[PDB]
Amino acid sequence: GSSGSSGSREKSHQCRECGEIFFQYVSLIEHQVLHMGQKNSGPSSG
Ligand SMILES: [Zn+2]
Question: Record's family?
Answer without folding.
Answer: Belongs to the krueppel C2H2-type zinc-finger protein family.
